[PDB]
Amino acid sequence: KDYDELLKYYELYETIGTGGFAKVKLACHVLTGEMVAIKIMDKNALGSDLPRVKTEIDALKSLRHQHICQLYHVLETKNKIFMVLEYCPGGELFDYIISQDRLSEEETRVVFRQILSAVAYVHSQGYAHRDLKPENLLFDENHKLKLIDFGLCAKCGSLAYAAPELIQGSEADVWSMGILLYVLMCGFLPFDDDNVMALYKKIMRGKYEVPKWLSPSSILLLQQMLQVDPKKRISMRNLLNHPWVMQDYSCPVEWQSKTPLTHLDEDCVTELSVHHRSSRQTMEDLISSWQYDHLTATYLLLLAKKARLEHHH
Numbered sequence: 686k687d688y689d690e691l692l693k694y695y696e697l698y699e700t701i702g703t704g705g706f707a708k709v710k711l712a713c714h715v716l717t718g719e720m721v722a723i724k725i726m727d728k729n730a731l732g733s734d735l736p737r738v739k740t741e742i743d744a745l746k747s748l749r750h751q752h753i754c755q756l757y758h759v760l761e762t763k764n765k766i767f768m769v770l771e772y773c774p775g776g777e778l779f780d781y782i783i784s785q786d787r788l789s790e791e792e793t794r795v796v797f798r799q800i801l802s803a804v805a806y807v808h809s810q811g812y813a814h815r816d817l818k819p820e821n822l823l824f825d826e827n828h829k830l831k832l833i834d835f836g837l838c839a840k841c842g843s844l845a846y847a848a849p850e851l852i853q854g855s856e857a858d859v860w861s862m863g864i865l866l867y868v869l870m871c872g873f874l875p876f877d878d879d880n881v882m883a884l885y886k887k888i889m890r891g892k893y894e895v896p897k898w899l900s901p902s903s904i905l906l907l908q909q910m911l912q913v914d915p916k917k918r919i920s921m922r923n924l925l926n927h928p929w930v931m932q933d934y935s936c937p938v939e940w941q942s943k944t945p946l947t948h949l950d951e952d953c954v955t956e957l958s959v960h961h962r963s964s965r966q967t968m969e970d971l972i973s974s975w976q977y978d979h980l981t982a983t984y985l986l987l988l989a990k991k992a993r994l995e996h997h998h
């Protein structure tokens with residue numbers, strides 16, 4: 686059905702979630718045996734939103750990072766688009782916050798530093814996410830955060846998280862992270878309403894309830910981030926070494942990628958070459974074209990698998 690080219694490389698399991706655009710399916714890469722998440726999108730249903738998909742894809746191909754969900758493979762058929770992705774079995778941050786009611790300040794800070802690491806890195810590559818919220822943050826197996834959903838990425842998004850300058854890009858991501866921070870620590874939104882007009886007025890007004898359990902430090906950070914005028918809003922630079930962010934850390938936030946593809950792994954390349962019937966030298970030329978085809982998927986999946994084993998050795 687144009688699924689059958691995909692079934693060459695993967696065997697599909699159950700649907701794990703949906704979004705406006707896409708169905709997400711658990712899958713297994715047959716050759717490596719690695720679990721993956723596959724994002725299936727119908728081009729005909731996408732309709733006039735198709736360019737956002739091509740923005741999403743080009744962005745994910747340019748980002749490689751510990752807190753950004755890795756893309757392994759992009760397949761296009763007549764009707765569908767498939768994105769093969771890192772499987773994050775922990776689910777959304779949103780569900781976690783709800784299971785705890787709210788997070789302790791100390792725990793908020795662990796989460797927040799990983800968000801900041803990912804977000805500062807996204808910016809260092811010239812993007813703005815524009816849809817930061819805890820539905821778009823996932824825990825992988827190690828309980829580490831991965832940022833997802835780059836469809837509104839720019840080189841928009843939910844209203845409750847949207848910056849006032851945007852409802853009428855670096856500064857805007859700071860506003861949304863400000864909203865995130867409120868939710869982690871409080872368990873509800875600073876601006877909420879059943880009426881969008883009422884909600885809009887609350888956002889522009891910029892006044893929210895400050896609960897008793899918050900620290901003065903965190904309160905101040907909130908007001909620095911939740912400045913309505915982007916000019917007065919705190920910059921990313923200063924967020925990265927902010928005193929609250931560093932409380933009880935000798936390490937300010939390391940946003941740089943710990944996972945560049947500096948050079949090719951011998952074990953992985955060797956393994957690839959045997960299956961592919963080519964020498965390691967030939968295979969090294971092939972991999973470096975980086976087409977996010979099946980060769981790319983298999984190399985990256987093999988690398989992901991090696992890294993996992995090496996952590997228990």
Ligand SMILES: CC(=O)c1cnc2ccc(-c3cc(Cl)c(O)c(Cl)c3)nc2c1N[C@H]1CC[C@H](CN(C)C)CC1
Pocket residue numbers: 701702703704705707709722724754770771772773774775776777820821823832833834835
């Ligand atoms: C539920 C689960 O356990 C799980 C496990 N592993 C994953 C691995 C990658 C992606 C993924 C999803 C989207 Cl929509 C992306 O754009 C990207 Cl880049 C990755 N999602 C999941 C994943 N996501 C589900 C499916 C629905 C999606 C929901 N809304 C868009 C809010 C997010 C939650």
